[PDB]
Structures are given as C-alpha cells and as structure tokens.
Amino acid sequence: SLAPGSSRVELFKRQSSKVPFEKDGKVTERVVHSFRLPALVNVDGVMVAIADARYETSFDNSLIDTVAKYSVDDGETWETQIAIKNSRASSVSRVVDPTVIVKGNKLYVLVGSYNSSRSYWTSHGDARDWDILLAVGEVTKSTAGGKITASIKWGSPVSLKEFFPAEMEGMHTNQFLGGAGVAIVASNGNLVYPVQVTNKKKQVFSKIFYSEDEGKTWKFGKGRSAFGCSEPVALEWEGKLIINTRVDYRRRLVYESSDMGNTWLEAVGTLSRVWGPSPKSNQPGSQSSFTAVTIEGMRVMLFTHPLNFKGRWLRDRLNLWLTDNQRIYNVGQVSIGDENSAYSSVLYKDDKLYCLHEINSNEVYSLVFARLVGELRIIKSVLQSWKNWDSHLSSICTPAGCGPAVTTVGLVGFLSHSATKTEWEDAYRCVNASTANAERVPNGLKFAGVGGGALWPVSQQGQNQRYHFANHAFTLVASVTIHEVPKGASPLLGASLDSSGGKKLLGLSYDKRHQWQPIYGSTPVTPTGSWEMGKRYHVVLTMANKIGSVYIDGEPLEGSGQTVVPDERTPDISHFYVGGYKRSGMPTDSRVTVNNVLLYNRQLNAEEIRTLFLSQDLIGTEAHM
Template sequence: LNLRVDALIAATIEGRKVMLYTQRGYASGEKRVNTLYLWVTDNNRSFYFGPIAMGNAANSMFVSSLLYSDGKLHLLQQRGNDKGGVISLARLTEELKTIKSVLSTWSKLDASFSASSTPTAGLVGLLSNSASGDAWIDDYRSVNAKVMNAVKVHDGFKFTGFGSGAIWPVNNRESNGPHTFVNYNFTLVATVIVHKVPKNSTTLLGAVLAEPVSTLFIGLSYGTDGTWETVFNGETTTSGSTWMPGKEYQVALMLQDGNKGSVYVDGMSVGSLATLPTPEVRGAEIADFYFVGGEDEEDKKSSSVTVKNVFLYNRPLGADELRMVKKIDGSMHGSVSRALLLLLGLCGFAALY
C-alpha cells in the first residue's frame, strides 16, 4: 500500500494560507490504490476531491507536481512504462473554483459559530441539515457519512431498528478518510433523542476500530432500565445517569492522548477510562464513527433514535466548552446548503475534466 504524498506546495487562496498536495488513493469500488486526488489543508481542516487522474498497468503514473502562480493552478504529470513516457500539463480551473468555494464556506461557518460562542478551534467536521441521497454531507466538506434505512429530519436523521444507522468514515483508508488525529485526540458531540425503551441494551453511537478488529472503542449505549451505559474497548459499564424517552440530550465522546476516554451527557461525565490501549498497543486505528438505530435483528422496530448536529473536533474539549457547542442557525443552514450543492456540482464537473 502506497499512500505517499506526490506533490506539496504552499499557497494563499481567499486570504487563507493552505497546503495543496496530491495523494494516491482508492477510487470508488476499487481495492487498489490507482487514482490521484487533490488535497487541501490549512493544518487544521482538510478536504479532497477527484480523482484528478487515473493510473493503470499499461501507463502507470509515477510523477506529479502542482504549480500555483498568478492565481492559476496546474498539474504536471509524467506517465510511462518500459516502452516510453509522456509529460502533460493541465490547468485545474474547476478544481481551483472548488477550493475557493470550500475556503469561503469554512470562513462563513466559523463566523456564524463564533457569533454564538460555539468553539471553532479544532472544529473539523459537522453533520447537520445537508444531505443528498444516502450521503449525510459534512458542512466543512471533509468526509461525508453514509446513511442506511433512515428518515431525514431537520438537522439530522431518525434511525429505527436493526440495519438503520450511519457510518462516518473519518479515518477509513478505503474511503480516503483524512482524520488520523482521531487515534489520539478528538471530541465528537451530537444532539440525540431516544424515542422508546429498547428490548435489549442498544448502542447509540461510538468510535469503532478498523477491520478486522472492529471493536467499539469508545461508545454510549442506552439500557432497558433507562440508564446510560458507556463502552470502552468493547466493555460495557452501566452508569448512574438516566435517560427519558423523547427527551433531547447533548452527548459527547472524547479521547485524549490516545488512552484516556470519556463520555458526557449534557456536559456531565457519565464514564471514563484512563487505561485504554494506545494505537501502538491495540494494533488497529479508529476508522469510523457509528450511529446506530438498533441491534435487535428479530424485532427491527424495537428501538428508534434521532441524531442531529454532529460536531467533530481534533482535540479534547473542556467541560465549559462542551456546554457552548450549539446548533447552527436556520439562516446559515440555507446559505451553507446552497454552497454545498454548488460544490457537489463543481466536483462532479472536475471529476470529468
């Protein structure tokens, strides 16, 4: 597996200093690394799009460089095999438009959250009201979540029963997830409603290790007796805190220094463990965040939850900061949703370029 960075340049775009680079990754449905993607990062947030080039056995792509000058972005490629090679230069006009739109969206979101005192330092992802088909669109345009058998509601989704839920592949290699920080430090904050008492203890959300391990590393479950349950490295513990059907809660999962896990409900700790195995010890990375509608295969309507306004930070938040995380206002939803639809169109055009 070779996921090396092929080209790396610094640029100032839309008044923001960013790094642009190309990296080989997986094309949709492919199991081998044979495509080239364009990545943008400001050393806090990252997003990618493409593929901007495809490789194959007959004409393998082995060198690429990015050039940014006078407000124009170009991709220089050298392709070849043992019979010869060719050099090409392509202007990435639509890709640059997409970059500018994404950076503008970041600024608008940050300004909106800052106005409501919601922490923006380390905020890298947001799942809220933007969705298209089975995609729950990240408003920060980094990694979308995949939704299964769910009903769209304002600011999120309602999940009912076994087989209903969402997967957010934030660090999943096959989905080109860029957020490696989740192995050491993160905070995931979500607004949730549990609509009914389940027949069995049921996972609500969690951070899951990559296959073949697939362990629920940090998670929150809700029990049949109305108590919250925490999960650390696959082990479930009943907390002293209770939940009520139909009531809205703000829940949070947190990891610090790779081995200190915590779970919060409405800003209060319901469980923690400071001896979790580090990435080096456990031998698997955190790959995905799961949102689960139910786990009873026989009774697929035994549980039902709503998950809304999911914030992902690349650092642990303090207790006071957790209480300051607020949902995005309706006016901002409208402008962001329109911007994201535009971005999806631009990315589709760029993929054909």
C-alpha cells in the same frame, strides 16, 4: 478525469524534445528519451520547470542531465536549457533528484552526482561514486518595447560534501540526496532541503539539511524520520516544518519539527498516515507535490500523489488534495483516465493553478503542463464553504453580552441539516456518513428498525483515511432524543474498533432501565444516570492520551475518564456509529433522533463543551441551507 475547463500540453515530450547537450565544449541539440522528477516554480514572475533529462533510456542508472524550461507568459511559450550537466565520465554519469528552492531571483538546485555506478544508490557499499552538488541560477527580466524577455544564468555546481558528517546519532553515514521536486525558504530566511540519507546498514531515512547563509554552508538537524522514509517534501506551517515522506509499501508518514529538524515529531493528530500509496497500501510510494499557499485569503496546503490502482511502480491516477490541516478534501484526479502519472509538481501563481506531471507509457516518460482550471474552481468552492461554516459558528452569540464563542479549532466534520436519501452530508464536504432507515428531520435524522443508523467511516475510508487522527485524539459531539424504550440496551453514538460495532473503543448506549450505558473500551459496562423518553440530550465523547470521557448535558458521567487503550499499541478505529449500528447484522433497534454531529481532532476543554451544550439550538445548518 482532468477537470472541465482544464487543459494541458506535452511540454517535455519524450523521444521528441531536444536539449543543448554539451560535451567537450561542443553543444548539440539532442533528443531525450524520457523526462522525470518535475519541479515547477515561480521566480519573480518567471515560470521555471526543472526535470531529469534522461537521454537514452528511462532507467535511474543512465546518462542524465538537468533540464530547465522557462516561460515569461504563464506557460504559453518556453525557452530550454540544461541547468546542470553530469561528469560525462561514462554511459551512466548522471545528476539525479534535482530539488529546487526559489529565493529572490535565485534558483538553488540540489542534485546527486554519479560517475559510473550501475547499482541503485541505496545499495552502494560506500560513497566513492557520489557527490552532492549545488548549482545556482540567476533569473533576469528585460523589456524591449512591450516585450518581456527573461534569461537564466546557471552557476558552475559546487560540492556540498564537506557538510556531510561521518556519523549521525549512533550510526555511520554513506550518502544523501534531495527529496526531489520543490523545497522551501523558511520564514526566517534559511534555505531548507528535506534530504534522504543512507547509513552503512543501507537503511534510508529523512533529515532536514539547511543553510543559514544563502547556501554558503550547510547543517543537518539532529533528528530524523523513521527508517524507510524516502523522498521527503516539506513545507512550513504555523512556525513548524511539516515533513511529508514516501514510505514504500506502507502509508505515508508525516512529521512536524519546530526546531529546524532537531526534534521530529510524528504528525499523528493531522496528516501522518492519511495517505496510502495504493488501495491496499502495499505498493511502492511516490514523489509528492506538497505546498503551502494562500487561496481566497485562506492559508492552505496542496498535496498530490498517484492512487496507483495498477500497482507496482505504474502509479496511475494522479490525485490532488486540499487541506487546511483540519479537513482533508480530495480535489480529484489530475491525470487523464488510466494513464500512468507518478511524479508531479503544483504551482499556484497569480491566482491561476498549474501542474507539471509525468505521463508514462511502456517506461517512456513525458512531462505534461496542465492548466488546472476546473481544479481551482472546486478548491475555491470548497474553501468558500469552509470559510462560511466556520464563520457561521464563530458568529453565533452564545447564552449568558454573549458567552464564549463556539469553537472551530480542530473542527473536522459536521453532520447537520443536509442529507440525501442514503447519505448524511459533511458540512465541510470531506467525509459523508452513510445512513439506513433514516428519515430527515431538522438538523439531523430520525432512525428506527434493525440495521438503522449512520456510519461515519474512519479506517473504512479505505486507501486514504482522513480521520486517522481519531486514533490518537478526538471529540464526537451530538444532540440526541430517544423515542422508544429498548428491549435490551441500544447504541446511540460511538467509535467502533471492528466493522460490526461489537468491539468499541468508546461509545454510549441506553437501556430498558432508563439509564445510560457509557462503554469505555473493553471495560465491563456500568449503567449510570437516568434519561427520560423524548427529552433532548447533549452527548460528548472525548478521547485523548488513551483516556475516554462521556458527557451528558455537559456533565461527565460517573465512571468517566477511564483508559480505553490498554497496551501501548495504537487503535485502528473502523467507523463512528450514530443512531444505531447501521448493520442489519446487529439485533438492536435504536429509535432515536440525532442532530448536529460534530467531530474535532482533539479533546475539547470544559468550556468549549459547555458552550456547545448551551448552543445546541443555534449551531444547526437548517436556515443557511
């Protein structure tokens, strides 16, 4: 897949494109074997693409310069230069992992520099072959007659080594490198590079390496990522740095830091561990584009990562993700079919969307320049929906002027009026729930029979788990109505720890005695309260700080607020079950109607809950389609 309407060109064409190779004061147009590590940026209207020019071989340990192409016509035509050249000291002299920051009309490029080491940088025993260099480009725009003509003057690189400490909290240092791709200017004007760093134990980890003074001098924030986080990419989001890391053979870790990387906190309630590196999350990781942009007046993030069905380092099926830090939408595949396409950089300029990404066959790497027309289409469509539901809900005037607004902060998923034969549609278009034995009713579904119910997938989302936040905190809200008295004790709503629904984290059931059975974790279940057949009730499950609550009609049940997470291990929620288990495997027959399921990524406060309870007649999506 590349969208309908989208298109591309082979901009850095492997074993074809030539570059001004300078050595001993003579320049030669030289063919390049492979191009890798793309970074696509916009400098004051001038599109600039920076990458690895790997001259003879694709290998990381080979002769490599840093190539820059720039266009003044949104990528129709380009000029080519080398921005940073290596030492020429040996056949493996190289400037590696170029990482780019744009500020004003200046391009700050940060590269590793090696002279003759043949082993991978992380396995080195000391820093003898290494320098870290900062080179700056000045971008200029002239206009003869009608015609726009740019030029970029590159500075001689400067070593930043003097800013590299001997010791970081309780370990000794070896080397460090940029995260590759595009870094940022913090809203306070600091230059911020997320960097990968090795200690003497040859562990890798990520830090924040920043300059407060336009890159004259550089500091490291005190804290770090966990070990094995490499190739970090960062963006700034509501005053915090969000650092998104490659972790080989594990799911991507994401961190927040409000204090320029002095303290790092794992973003468990949003994006951390959402993205897996491969279906089974058991393969090598990747370089990711991760940018904050404003599209259709909404502030959003765009993330890319290959799905890597092939496994090993092939990294086929480059995917684009859209997030508002609440909802996570898979825009789709950007690469074309089963082609290998790992590293990527996404640029949003003048309301048009572009991507510079790798294509790899047989370890010969090109970079394509893709006009993501169809992708923007979808993005714009999804945002519209998000804006509209959110608007719709805030717009509701609640019961006794108007009461407090319906909350949409941390509102992630909404199951309401729209449903297909086998699926209940998320209003926010991110994660549907599947259904069986479901009959459509206003704003929800009537279920009946064995195996009846709806399943909202959590860990069961598979390779990318957008709902992973629920393991730390969530609120699940729904309107329910019971139509038949059960022969045992039947399920209504809950968070399942196993794929059958047997083992629950937190849930609600109802019994033959006309009582509620709130289930807190593995705690012996004590039935409480009473319900009558055919009356509609408001059900709220909240879980935060390992404690679960259950509210009926906005009142917590007796015995509510118990520990559901015994050890200090994290839960791994299988799915949410609604109106049954949706397993023919379980013997229960839940005959109920559920309406307006809401999912929030935090615990709702007493007032937000109470609002929702009074508003249950007017939150539904029925009218609006």
